Amino acid sequence: STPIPAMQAALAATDLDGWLVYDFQGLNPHARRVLGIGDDVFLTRRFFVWVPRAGRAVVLHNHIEGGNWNRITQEWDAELRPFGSHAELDAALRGVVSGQRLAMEYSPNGAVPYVSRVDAGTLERVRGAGAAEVASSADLLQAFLVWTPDDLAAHRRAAALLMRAKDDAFRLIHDRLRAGQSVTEWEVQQLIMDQIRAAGMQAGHDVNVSFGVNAADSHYEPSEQRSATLHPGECVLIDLWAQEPGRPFADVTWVGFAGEPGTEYLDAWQAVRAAREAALELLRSRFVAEGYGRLQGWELDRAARDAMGERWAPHFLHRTGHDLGVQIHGAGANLDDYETRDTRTLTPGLSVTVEPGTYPAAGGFGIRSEVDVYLAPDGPEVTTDLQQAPFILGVGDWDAVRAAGYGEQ
Amino acid sequence: STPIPAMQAALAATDLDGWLVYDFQGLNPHARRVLGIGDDVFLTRRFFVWVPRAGRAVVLHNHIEGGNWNRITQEWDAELRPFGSHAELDAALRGVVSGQRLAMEYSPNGAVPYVSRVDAGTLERVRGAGAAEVASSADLLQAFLVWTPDDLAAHRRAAALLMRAKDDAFRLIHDRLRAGQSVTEWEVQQLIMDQIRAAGMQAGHDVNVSFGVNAADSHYEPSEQRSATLHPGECVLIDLWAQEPGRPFADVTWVGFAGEPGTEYLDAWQAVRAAREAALELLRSRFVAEGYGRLQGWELDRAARDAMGERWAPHFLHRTGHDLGVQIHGAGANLDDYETRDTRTLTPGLSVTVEPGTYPAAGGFGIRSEVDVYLAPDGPEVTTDLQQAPFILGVGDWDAVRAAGYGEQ
Ligand SMILES: [Cl-]
Ligand SMILES: [Cl-]
Ligand SMILES: [Zn+2]
Ligand SMILES: [Zn+2]
Ligand SMILES: [Zn+2]
Ligand SMILES: [Zn+2]
Structure with a gap:
């Protein structure tokens, strides 16, 4: 060749x-x-x-x-x-x-x-x-690194699977809480992994289900040997990903809480949501103003971190997001002014995640909201669902818990 | 550790x-x-x-x-x-x-x-x-890379083996020429390899025996499948090396000619010998003047190439020598202003080869004279023998052929 x-x-x-x-x-x-x-x-x-x-x-x-x-x-x-x-x-x-x-x-x-x-x-x-x-x-x-049409279609099939799987995972937790039956991180993880495998997809590394203080550790992965049992009053964070073989991943993170969360958790959520929206809004507004070609990855991290505010940004000791490809952490531009100042330009035909969060381990909790964005030539577009509120698990019927998390009430 | x-x-x-x-x-x-x-x-x-x-x-x-x-x-x-x-x-x-x-x-x-x-x-x-x-x-x-005393002793045992093996190899050629019996590069190579192996040593790559125009190719290695038969009026070049396992190599190159060489070959020899002597003399004179610490590898290449002169230097398209270690081409300073300008300083306790040559392929021939030099703290010293003339093979008794090659007549 x-x-x-x-x-x-x-x-x-x-x-x-x-x-x-x-x-x-x-x-x-x-x-x-x-x-x-x-x-x-x-x-x-x-x-x-x-x-x-x-x-x-x-x-x-x-x-x-x-x-x-x-x-x-x-x-x-x-x-x-x-x-x-x-x-x-x-x-x-x-x-x-x-x-x-x-x-x-x-x-x-x-x-x-x-x-x-x-x-x-x-x-x-x-x-x-x-x-x-x-x-x-x-x-x-x-x-x-530009996606082909078949790459994009495969990414969207993975995205749809993840949207289903995260609902089923959170519904499992909801049902266990309502019934007073124990649930572990590993059990929820394996529900998700079974769904990924049944769909002909693969995750690479097993997905992250974190309860309580474990959600403050970005580098947490439950296992059969060591995983936590959920208790009322603890947060839940689920970061799950999947690809068809040889195709780009989808990769999302959704949050919930075992019972009614306190004001501090809710305030942290608003800050994380504001951070996500600010990154998405800068991407959209810059594209409208001048198209792609000048906006660099670090600028979306700055937007998110600034918008998160002085209370919660000190507990956001991570980049805002990463290039998303056949490798989940792809070789293209990342949304990072934290670990690196990534001056690479956001490139049409690639995809990035937007996944700000805040992680006060001291009970302690972690919140992250992750969506995938495809940098379509006609403008950036989110390819996974936008969470509007943490799922308030174990209270009411699941359909309504989900609707509130989607802002559909 | x-x-x-x-x-x-x-x-x-x-x-x-x-x-x-x-x-x-x-x-x-x-x-x-x-x-x-x-x-x-x-x-x-x-x-x-x-x-x-x-x-x-x-x-x-x-x-x-x-x-x-x-x-x-x-x-x-x-x-x-x-x-x-x-x-x-x-x-x-x-x-x-x-x-x-x-x-x-x-x-x-x-x-x-x-x-x-x-x-x-x-x-x-x-x-x-x-x-x-x-x-x-x-x-x-x-x-x-500094040699221990046991490293130096092992290098000298390899050097002594190579001095014996090159005599036996050239005596084989001498005897075959005198008897009018065919001899190939591979046969001579295998005599040397057998001697190396019998001594408990190893060569890594099989050694170089080159007849005639093959001596003009530094990258020549005979094999069982392809090797030349010697004819009267052709040169011989033998580059042979050996180490005890885990110890520094010795590595030398000696030359001869099948019968009486012409004036051109003899003139080339004088130029190569002058190049070798100039490198050795600069090393010695700089050490006497100021010790080690300023002299750099490239300077010995310049000395050799300058001394070789305008007739034969155009056919010397190689560096003058290399660091000599447990790897035959060691990681230390090389005597090179040709492929690289090696500004590394010659370091006490290491060893280098001095191996200028000239390679007019157009019959065509190649000459290289290689000695090893140990950079002893008390002054540089050659650890292998110095050839004074090409062995004039097939004429007279071997003892006298060898003596003339050593300048011992
Ligand atoms: Cl790094
Ligand atoms: Cl190179
Ligand atoms: Zn991600
Ligand atoms: Zn993720
Ligand atoms: Zn050498
Ligand atoms: Zn050699």
């Missing part, structure tokens, strides 16, 4: 002159992935592949691995240019980069480690060869 | 304030090797380990992997400092690097890819945190 058409199509949406892919052994996994180099290909020497906007790619390779490079590129219609000495390497590099505004796997300030792969010394060498500009390839790399 | 004493001992021989080890997943293999982190340890997040000249190491790690970091460091007597947000990371980094002259796995201009592992963006971040100087850790890394 040839990787060059896809790389040039990605470049066409930029104003850059080309993409300079550099690798040495395991340094830059993106190099081998974008170029379609098989894992079984043994490459011990450094190489560059220059891909201009239009025209032939240029492969700068050490002459000792010319045979492997002929095989790699036999369908590429590229120039293959061997080098031996550092003088030959530098002359070839000057030939390709001088006066060029180019991208490399580089992240300013090392903000995004998964993209920041080219070593400092090699970047110095590229600049010394006369490159006019070195920009991050992070946005180019996102072009490869 | 704890890696910190060895790192501080290495730092003591420098004027730097400390060594800042950075890694993210597979980016910097040196990080995990120097720190003694087992391959079975799953670390998904970036980390820094600050090792000052004296005092506690400081580990900056993501809080999500604190458990793994407790286990890694349980014998280190280090400070463990978690971070979550980028603001926390940057405050911690400023605390450790501000005003410090430090080393990282960084190679200016990307001259030495095996050392140049920290990404450009992370280096920007370290400088932005106030580091006073970022220097390459390349020389620090060489401190870990």
Whole structure:
């Protein structure tokens, strides 16, 4: 196969002159992935592949691995240019980069480690060869993550399954509370996992059902060996996800409470809901104003965190959301100004989660509300349901508990 | 175990304030090797380990992997400092690097890819945190390559075996030529390999016996399936190496000719010998003048290449030599201003090969003369024999052929 058409199509949406892919052994996994180099290909020497906007790619390779490079590129219609000495390497590099505004796997300030792969010394060498500009390839790399129509349809089937499963899970808890019968996190988790598997889907890791203080630990997963029994007066948080094999996940988080919650929990909910709405509103309003192309992931985190307010933001020690793909935590832009300042631009055809929360462990509780957003070319759209209130579990009939949680009363 | 004493001992021989080890997943293999982190340890997040000249190491790690970091460091007597947000990371980094002259796995201009592992963006971040100087850790890394007395003794046993084996190999060729009996490269190779194995040693890759034009290909290895039969009027080159398991290799190259060589071959020999002597003489004279500590690997390549002269240097399209270790091509300084400009300093207790050659394939021939040099604290010393003339094979008695090759007539 040839990787060059896809790389040039990605470049066409930029104003850059080309993409300079550099690798040495395991340094830059993106190099081998974008170029379609098989894992079984043994490459011990450094190489560059220059891909201009239009025209032939240029492969700068050490002459000792010319045979492997002929095989790699036999369908590429590229120039293959061997080098031996550092003088030959530098002359070839000057030939390709001088006066060029180019991208490399580089992240300013090392903000995004998964993209920041080219070593400092090699970047110095590229600049010394006369490159006019070195920009991050992070946005180019996102072009490869665009969903197909079948990907979107599969995501929506997973979303619908999750909406059903979260209702059945919360109804189970509701029924147990009303009946005074014990229920554990693991039992609820397994109800959900059984539904995912029966639908031909898979979760990867077992889903998160958290009661009480466990909901304050984002890194909680109940198991058969260790899981909590629910008691009245404790919160519930369920973060569940599923995909059809090889298709994008859906991934949502819904909350409830065992009985009537107090004012503090309710206030925290309003703050988390306000955070979610602020992120969604900034995404919508920026798209209306200017389309996609300037809005960056970190800005939605800022919107959510600001809107959450001074009482509950100190207990929101997490990013606002993540790229959502065939990997649940996808390789594209995340909604993060917390762990990283993610300056990647939100890209049409990708999807992100919006999942602010607040986690006061000191009883202690955790709230998170997670929806998925597909960055459709005609505008961002939420693909999973919006919770308006925590489910108040064990009081009344389930249909009405659900309706209140949906704001349908 | 704890890696910190060895790192501080290495730092003591420098004027730097400390060594800042950075890694993210597979980016910097040196990080995990120097720190003694087992391959079975799953670390998904970036980390820094600050090792000052004296005092506690400081580990900056993501809080999500604190458990793994407790286990890694349980014998280190280090400070463990978690971070979550980028603001926390940057405050911690400023605390450790501000005003410090430090080393990282960084190679200016990307001259030495095996050392140049920290990404450009992370280096920007370290400088932005106030580091006073970022220097390459390349020389620090060489401190870990110093031979023990048992390593040196094992190297010398391998050297002695190679001196015997190369005599027996060339005597075999001599005898076959005198008798008019065919001899192949593979037959000679297998004589040598049998001797290596009988001595309890191992070669890794089968050794190089090259006849005629094959000696012009540095990347030639005969095999049972494909090997040449010697004819009168062709050169011979034998590059052979061996180690005791887990001990440093010896690695040498000796040349001969089937019958009396012409003036061109003899002139090439004088140039290669002059190149070898010039590298050895610069090493010796610099040590006498100033000891080790300033002389860099590339300078011996320049000496050899300059001395080879304008007729034969154009056919010397290779580095002058390599670090010699438990890996035949060791991780330390190489004698190279050809493929790379290796600015690493020649380090007492390591060994290098000096192996200039010239390879005019157009009959065509190749000459290389390789000796091993141990960088003893009291001065550099050659540990294998110095060839003074190519063996003139098939003429006279072997003892005299050998004596002429040794300059012993
Ligand atoms: Cl290389
Ligand atoms: Cl990380
Ligand atoms: Zn999520
Ligand atoms: Zn989720
Ligand atoms: Zn060698
Ligand atoms: Zn050799």
